[PDB]
Design an enzyme around this catalytic site. Structure first.
Site, PDB file in Angstrom:
ATOM      1  CB  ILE A  32      -0.889  -0.059   1.029  1.00  0.00           C
ATOM      2  CG1 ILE A  32      -0.465  -0.087   2.584  1.00  0.00           C
ATOM      3  CG2 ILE A  32      -2.111  -1.172   1.019  1.00  0.00           C
ATOM      4  CD1 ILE A  32      -1.222   0.116   3.818  1.00  0.00           C
ATOM      5  CB  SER A  36      14.182   6.376   0.960  1.00  0.00           C
ATOM      6  OG  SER A  36      14.121   7.048  -0.286  1.00  0.00           O
ATOM      7  N   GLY A  38      12.021   1.328   2.489  1.00  0.00           N
ATOM      8  CA  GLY A  38      11.218   0.079   2.381  1.00  0.00           C
ATOM      9  C   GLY A  38       9.808   0.129   1.760  1.00  0.00           C
ATOM     10  CB  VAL A  40       3.653   0.930   3.995  1.00  0.00           C
ATOM     11  CG1 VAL A  40       2.500   0.770   5.098  1.00  0.00           C
ATOM     12  CG2 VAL A  40       4.701   1.960   4.513  1.00  0.00           C
ATOM     13  CG  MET A 107      -4.987   1.202   7.594  1.00  0.00           C
ATOM     14  SD  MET A 107      -3.570   0.845   6.608  1.00  0.00           S
ATOM     15  CE  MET A 107      -3.750  -1.087   6.672  1.00  0.00           C
ATOM     16  CG  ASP A 154      12.368  14.435   6.053  1.00  0.00           C
ATOM     17  OD1 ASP A 154      12.690  15.469   5.555  1.00  0.00           O
ATOM     18  OD2 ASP A 154      12.448  13.334   5.352  1.00  0.00           O
TER      19      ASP A 154
HETATM   20  F1  LIG Z   1       1.116   2.876   2.987  1.00  0.00           F
HETATM   21  C1  LIG Z   1       0.354   4.064   3.107  1.00  0.00           C
HETATM   22  C2  LIG Z   1      -1.160   4.031   3.541  1.00  0.00           C
HETATM   23  C3  LIG Z   1      -0.986   3.964   4.967  1.00  0.00           C
HETATM   24  N1  LIG Z   1       0.252   4.174   5.506  1.00  0.00           N
HETATM   25  C4  LIG Z   1       0.730   4.190   6.596  1.00  0.00           C
HETATM   26  N2  LIG Z   1      -0.289   3.591   7.519  1.00  0.00           N
HETATM   27  C5  LIG Z   1       0.302   3.560   8.984  1.00  0.00           C
HETATM   28  C6  LIG Z   1       1.411   3.924   9.137  1.00  0.00           C
HETATM   29  C7  LIG Z   1       2.390   4.419   8.097  1.00  0.00           C
HETATM   30  C8  LIG Z   1       3.777   4.859   8.266  1.00  0.00           C
HETATM   31  C9  LIG Z   1       4.254   4.606   9.713  1.00  0.00           C
HETATM   32  N3  LIG Z   1       5.646   5.422   9.430  1.00  0.00           N
HETATM   33  N4  LIG Z   1       5.732   5.318   8.329  1.00  0.00           N
HETATM   34  N5  LIG Z   1       6.961   6.122   7.846  1.00  0.00           N
HETATM   35  C10 LIG Z   1       6.854   6.380   6.505  1.00  0.00           C
HETATM   36  C11 LIG Z   1       5.815   6.177   5.610  1.00  0.00           C
HETATM   37  C12 LIG Z   1       4.570   5.892   6.295  1.00  0.00           C
HETATM   38  C13 LIG Z   1       4.606   5.356   7.657  1.00  0.00           C
HETATM   39  N6  LIG Z   1       2.014   4.675   6.907  1.00  0.00           N
HETATM   40  C14 LIG Z   1       1.185   4.414   4.142  1.00  0.00           C
END
Ligand SMILES: F[C@H]1CCN(c2nccc(-c3cnn4ncccc34)n2)C1
Length: 340
Positions: A32, A36, A38, A40, A107, A154
């Site tokens: 999903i 950089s 990895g 998700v 999520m 960042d």
């Molecule tokens: F796939 C996308 C839709 C749901 N997402 C999501 N959902 C929960 C946590 C995170 C997340 C946690 N840390 N980071 N760091 C970097 C980038 C994402 C995250 N991303 C991203």
């Protein structure tokens, strides 16, 4: 050619397989997101009976160690915000799986860059910008609590995610580049459009750098486009100066990198090294305070009066103060009349 016994691709990433079961617990659904760091994935946690997002870090030491820093900081924030009222993503647990560090999160939904794309890069309303600003200032107030003292380092639209696609609630993510006030190590930090003048100038920094980034982010969320879109550091500083003028001499006089961008005149004043002249690209006109908002597109819209815009402009200019000692801090940002 084989990577990680066949489990990895040539980018150090785990090869996601739908339906795979991990550790007698997680059933992987689908990829999903990616970055950089990895990947998700959406996964079902069969033990807690809920969907989760698993951030699968690349199987490579530099990425692993970046993520270990992130895990430590998320764990510290966790134990200091058990009610989850401060707008930071919640790390549920972590584990090592097939040579990848995996972080399990609640999520979330789309990031704020995705939202800007969804507006066709025309921006969200001032009212939605206000809701995002209040949540971000609350998050920065929490990061500034002494036992944390976390500098995100960042902040950018991509690192702010909606909780739900139809609601305004947000969470900050990505603490891999972060640090704490007592252990500031990095000299080269912040994504360029969102980088503070103290970092550009090679000066000491603190949590105020995140407030600078927030000011930039909030203008972009309402206009649709980055406020300071430099192609390199010299262009970045020049774009800042077009809006805000030459920085104060008391700052430039103490800046190791002043002469990368500026020259000192016999007056003792400083000027740019050989853009719109300094301070003539007015934020007042970028926002369209008196001319119907950005592009005139908010003319005749509720919630976008001159009074509303003047409040927003005043707050932004306090976030974009060149002096990090007087730049507005989160406690006071939350009291500003933009939020009343
Ligand atoms: F796939 C996308 C839709 C749901 N997402 C999501 N959902 C929960 C946590 C995170 C997340 C946690 N840390 N980071 N760091 C970097 C980038 C994402 C995250 N991303 C991203």
């Amino acid at each position: 050619k084989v990577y990680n016994d066949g489990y990895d691709d040539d980018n150090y990433d785990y090869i996601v397989k739908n339906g795979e079961k991990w550790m007698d617990r997680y059933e992987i659904d689908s990829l999903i997101g990616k970055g950089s760091f990895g990947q998700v994935v959406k996964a079902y946690d069969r033990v807690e009976q809920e969907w989760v997002a698993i951030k699968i870090i690349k199987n490579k030491k530099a990425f692993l160690n970046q993520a270990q820093i992130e895990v430590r900081l998320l764990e510290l924030m966790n134990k200091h915000d058990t009610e989850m009222k401060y707008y930071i993503v919640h790390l549920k647990r972590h584990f090592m799986f097939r040579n990848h560090l995996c972080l399990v999160f609640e999520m979330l939904s789309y990031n704020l860059y995705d939202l800007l794309r969804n507006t066709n890069f025309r921006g969200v309303s001032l009212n939605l910008t206000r809701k995002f600003a209040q949540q971000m200032c609350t998050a920065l107030l929490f990061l500034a609590t002494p036992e944390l003292s976390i500098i995100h380092c960042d902040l950018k639209p991509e690192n702010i995610l909606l909780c739900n696609p139809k609601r305004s609630a947000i969470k900050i993510v990505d603490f891999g580049s972060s640090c704490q006030l007592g252990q500031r190590i990095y000299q080269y930090i912040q994504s360029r459009f969102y980088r503070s003048p103290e970092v550009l100038l090679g000066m000491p920094y603190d949590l105020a750098i995140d407030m600078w980034s927030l000011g930039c982010i909030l203008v972009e969320m309402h206009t649709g486009e980055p406020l300071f879109s430099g192609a390199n550091e010299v262009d970045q500083m020049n774009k800042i100066v077009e809006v805000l003028g030459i920085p104060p001499a008391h700052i430039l006089d103490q800046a190791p990198k002043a002469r990368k961008f500026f020259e000192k005149l016999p007056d003792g004043t400083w000027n740019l090294k050989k853009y719109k002249p300094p301070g003539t690209r007015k934020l007042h006109n970028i926002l369209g305070v008196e001319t119907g908002g950005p592009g005139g597109r908010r003319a005749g819209e509720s919630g976008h009066t001159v009074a509303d815009y003047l409040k927003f402009k005043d707050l932004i200019l306090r976030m974009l103060d060149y002096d990090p000692k007087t730049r507005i801090q989160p406690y006071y940002a939350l009291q500003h009349s933009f939020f009343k």
